[model samples]
Target: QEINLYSSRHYNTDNELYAKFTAETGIKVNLIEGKADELLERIKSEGANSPADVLLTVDLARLWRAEEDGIFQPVQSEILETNVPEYLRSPDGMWFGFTKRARVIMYNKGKVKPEELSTYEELADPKWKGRVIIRSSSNEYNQSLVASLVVADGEESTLAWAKGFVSNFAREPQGNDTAQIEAVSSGEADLTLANTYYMGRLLESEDPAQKAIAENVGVFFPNQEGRGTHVNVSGVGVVKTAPNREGAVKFIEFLVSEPAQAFLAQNNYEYPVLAGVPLNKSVASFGEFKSDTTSLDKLGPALAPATKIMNEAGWK
Candidate 1:
């Protein structure tokens, strides 16, 4: 048996896991890799003729978009229900989160103290003005992060927070999470909001320069005493027109299995959806903090309003 998979997760370690799946299940996996948007469009254009059995991509925003576009069929499995957390998976089983990433506050050691950092809201304080850096509003990661704020603080408060946040920009928001971390290291900004795994990447990098950047910064999980730090996921779902429906379900089940969870947590530097999977050393080094368990599925409806707030507040 075989299944065609369209995935945006670009990790060589994932290839190893897929191979392991094939060896264990005796099912060959045909992989198609590309950007999430392009893959979504391709699936829509392909219609019922699409060979895609599963669509795996990062972030709740992307998964929500795919679900809205009629890309996934609801799946029901005992293994899925038992393995994935209710908040991390769709209520209707349309999608399941395999790995988790927290959007955390990373600060320059020379400029900021871990004790000084608190909630995400505090980052907008007047004291942080001209000392914060983040990517543009167009980035889905930022949008989803803001979406969580909308969920928690109401749009009015979030908008006000955004205004203060924008006023705090060390420079016009530019670059990916790595650049944000590098900016903090270079003293262009005191801190940035970025995925935890990005810090893991820098910490585990082979290059001295990247390692130096990582060494210059410290990670702080915000909102620890409150709703907890905001967390997102890299998730997967069965395609609506999947030709190998059974195989797709089995593949997804295998992903949540302990062995796969171990590989994902350690090699991908992401938190496993399943409990008991030990975190990667680099990830564990950041220290433990409470994760905002707000259902990621809730982030979908808030995305548009979050964008409006960001745009209105001039968060470039």
Candidate 2:
């Protein structure tokens, strides 16, 4: 049976590995790539006729959204259970995270001292006003992070943080994370939040200019002792209605294995799901910090509410 992968992952570097999987397993990998939410909706629209056998995504919140739709069948594969950690997989096995990216703060080394901030909530204080740059609260990453706050801090306190956060905005939220980073480094702003991989990309980037900027900013993982680094995952699951569900599980297995994990680590600059895998130079150098991801289930439920808080916070 052909394995259809409806993926929002657009990185071309993963193609060689997919080709290798096809060659070794003799099961063709038909990848359909696009936005995660759109693909999830299309799958819903397709109902039982959906051509997708596997659904792959880059964020835990996105994967959680699909799983909430009751679209995936949790597999009992020993391979999946053994390889992926509990915090990286659902208790019911409906979804499994294969790659991880850290949500970190980047600030101009020349402008801010490293000791200035510790946790996400600290950013809400009025003293940081006019020095912060983050994307519009509309971005899912920000939403997920804030959602985590809501769960940890409760609605009343979280709402207060949102209120204080807007008061701190350097300007109405604008641009993607990379642009936000550029804004800080270029003096348009002093700080912004970004995924670790982007910082990895710049430092490991072939372009001298980007590498220079990478050096200009200090990367801080908020609240290392408390919540640790805020991280999100790229994950996959087999569709419950898939005609080739077995083959789809097999493909998911391949992703969490050694080869696929390494390729992602090196090319996409992401961390692997399985522990003990050697990280790339950029990622490895980012230094070891505790992850606040003790609960994988905590990851998904953050999406929608985070959006609401960001809106209320006037992130714009």
Candidate 3:
């Protein structure tokens, strides 16, 4: 039997990591990369004929959607269960996370002080109107955030917050996360939400141009005084038709193992889901942060309700 991994993740660096994994394990990992939606449809269309042994993706909403679609099979492995945190993997063991990210505020150093704004919920303030910049409302990061807000802040408040987000945009929400940081730095906008790993990469990048992105910005973990910062993960699941299920499970185990977790600080500009991993020095200087203990599973169901609230709030 063969193990073929279908992934929607687009990063080039990750491809290199996959190659390294193949060199070590001799598992003959066959990988196919594509956009999330296309991959999802392909799996659904292919059904039992699918040669896929694993499916990797970046967002909880996407995975939750897959779980809803019956794409993965439940896994039973002590290696996976013991190495990964309970909240980091699916309850039924259908999926497990290998990398992590945080959506935190990146402020224009001159316009805002960290002390004045300490929570994700504060982005909706009238004072920040026309002063904040972010990605489009359709982006999963923002969607999941609003979804999580629905869980923590309720529909009524989350709706109002979404509308406030539109009123607060420095310009129509556009561009990639790096561009958002640039907008804040250039005074095109004063602040925005960004993933922690992007900033970490910019800070540590060999390109001076990339490192400059970090020079002009400061990061703040929102709600540090309350539920703490929000976090999401990049994860993988064995495909329902996996022919080499044991190999796939072992690959997952290697990814979250102690060495892999330690290497996570330097991998893909994201956090290591495991406890003992020391953050890379560049990330460490961003200062320590507190992540909300709320599980991704907890955040999954609330996403749609959050969008409904987002619609009412005018978060377009």
* Evaluation by lDDT, superior candidate among 2 and 3: 2
Residue-level lDDT of model 1, residues 1-316, one tens digit each, is 9999999887768799899899989999999998787789999999798999999987888899899888999999998999998988888899999899999999999989889999999989999989999998887788899999999999999999999999989899899888999999999999999999889988888899999999999999999899999998889999999999999999999999999999888877889989878999999999988988864657889988999999999988
**Model 2, span 154-212: residue lDDT tens:** 76788898988788888888888888888899988788899988888888888999988
Q: CA shift at 240, candidate 1, in angstroms?
A: 1.1
lDDT of candidate 1 at residue 314, scale 0 to 100: 96
In model 2, the clashing pairs are none
Find the candidate with the highest lDDT and give its number.
1
List the global CA lDDT of all models.
0.91, 0.83, 0.80
Candidate 3 regions off by >4 Å? 312-316
Write out the backbone clash pairs for model 1.
none
C-alpha RMSD (angstroms) for model 3: 1.7
Scored by lDDT, model 3 comes in at 0.80
Model 1 poorest ten-residue lDDT run? 291-300
lDDT of 3 at 238: 82
Cα lDDT tens digits, model 3, 109-141, are 888888878777778889897898888777778
Local lDDT at 134 for model 2: 90
